[PDB]
């Protein structure tokens, strides 16, 4: 079986500049007909893969001229010469020289943009959930760049780490930022035992954490 | 254009079976080799099975992983491809695509192999220049859900976060950010479909 090797990530690319995505195969994909049976696909978030390039360097119908590709029989490079925000996704190589068909592990394109602090929003447990004996406190840290960020939960002044779960989005296809949710799940009794809830976001865009709070009894 | 559309996914227990299919339109189905390719975290894109034409006596091909477990078949008269999937293990969980080599992929149909029970989500409103709202979609199984706002009308400014799994239940939230001039004065509603439980629910975000 052919192993197709790709790095999981590339260096972040500034908008309007060129990105290069590499792939290598464990066997030559050059055939005696002079064609190299190497293909590129793009999978955008929430979507299936779609064909970009066939036979090493040929563009599929409707693919923008921003995309090009070359290589040897074993080492290949896809170039996106003037990257746009919508090009974020995972780019896969594949061969067509034998069975089994195999794919590279995919390289995610990351756009580099100007640092942006998060917009922080905090939400107490809804009344509906409280009717049920659980209590989820939710904090969104939205539309920030770069992806690295810390959240902290303080209840009546004390840091809480137990019961917190964080989820990051993929890079946004419009503004090239990330978002994160932090959800603190408590029992109803534990929630009712304390009144002042705070979510604090610490991002490289300031030495000051961004603080959002509510009071349970208000 | 050419369109590939899978169906038949859902949940089954380990050792059980599933049968999925896809219909291809926009070309003459009978003249094309057809394959199934699945996608998962551990193994990424994985070709599993392939079938040639009537003139090839419907020759079939399988990845070693699934040999003896999967059978690919085609009904040219219905433009339909099938995959019968037997003696399933948890690692057979994934999104299953029909792939017409090398040009065309479907949207995928999700297959979960687990002994955990299907559970619909509880859906909770998250109410507080620009105003950020949300919904909490808690305690469902299996994936996926689809979350929309205002029946899909409200699409920009939306962040639906990846789910987290805890104790055989998934939870996610979705935020939407809108102009304050737009809420509470026209309504903002989250809609949550969970295909495995055949449920759909709407929750209006109210002050």
């Amino acid at each position: 079986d052919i192993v197709m090797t790709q790095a999981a990530f590339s260096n972040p690319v500034t908008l309007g500049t060129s990105a290069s995505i590499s792939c290598r195969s464990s066997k030559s994909l050059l055939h005696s007909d002079g064609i190299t049976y190497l293909y590129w696909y793009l999978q955008k978030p929430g979507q299936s893969p779609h064909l970009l390039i066939y036979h090493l360097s040929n563009l599929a119908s409707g693919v923008p001229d921003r995309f090009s590709s070359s290589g040897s029989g074993t080492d290949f490079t896809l170039r996106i010469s003037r990257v746009e925000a919508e090009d974020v996704g995972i780019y896969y190589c594949a061969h067509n020289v034998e069975l089994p068909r195999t794919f590279g592990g995919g390289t995610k394109l990351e756009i580099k943009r100007a640092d942006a602090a998060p917009t922080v929003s905090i939400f107490p447990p809804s009344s509906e959930q409280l009717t049920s004996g659980g209590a989820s406190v939710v904090c969104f840290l939205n539309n920030f760049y770069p992806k690295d960020i810390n959240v902290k939960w303080k209840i009546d002044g004390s840091e809480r780490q137990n019961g917190v779960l964080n989820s990051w989005t993929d890079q946004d296809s419009k503004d090239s930022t990330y978002s994160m949710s932090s959800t603190l799940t408590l029992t109803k009794d534990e929630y009712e035992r304390h009144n002042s809830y705070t979510c604090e976001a610490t991002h490289k865009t300031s030495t000051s954490p961004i603080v959002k709070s509510f009071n349970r009894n208000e | 254009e050419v369109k590939v559309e899978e169906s038949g996914g859902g949940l089954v227990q380990p050792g059980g079976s599933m049968k999925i299919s896809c219909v291809v339109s926009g070309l003459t189905f009978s003249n094309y080799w057809m394959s199934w390719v699945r996608q998962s975290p551990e193994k990424g894109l994985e070709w599993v099975a392939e079938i040639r034409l009537k003139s090839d006596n419907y020759a079939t091909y399988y990845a070693e992983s699934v040999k003896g477990k999967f059978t690919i078949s085609r009904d040219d008269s219905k433009s339909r491809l099938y995959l019968q999937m037997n003696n399933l293990r948890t690692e057979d969980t994934g999104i299953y695509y029909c792939f017409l080599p090398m040009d065309y992929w479907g949207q995928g149909t999700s297959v979960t192999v687990s002994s955990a029970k299907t559970t619909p989500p509880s859906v909770y409103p998250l109410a507080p220049s620009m105003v950020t709202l949300g919904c909490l979609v808690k305690g469902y199984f299996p994936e996926p859900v689809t979350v929309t706002w205002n029946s899909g009308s409200l699409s920009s400014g939306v962040h639906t976060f990846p789910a987290v799994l805890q104790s055989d239940l998934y939870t996610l939230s979705s935020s939407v950010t809108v102009p304050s001039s737009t809420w509470p004065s026209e309504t903002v509603t989250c809609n949550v479909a969970h295909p495995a439980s055949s449920t759909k629910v709407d929750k209006k975000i109210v002050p």
Binding site: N96, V97, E98, L99 | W33, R52
Partner: peptide, 11 residues
């Protein structure tokens, strides 16, 4: 494989 593919794909 390729011989089969090429024959198929030309048709």
């Amino acid at each position: 494989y390729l011989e089969d593919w090429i024959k198929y794909n030309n048709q």
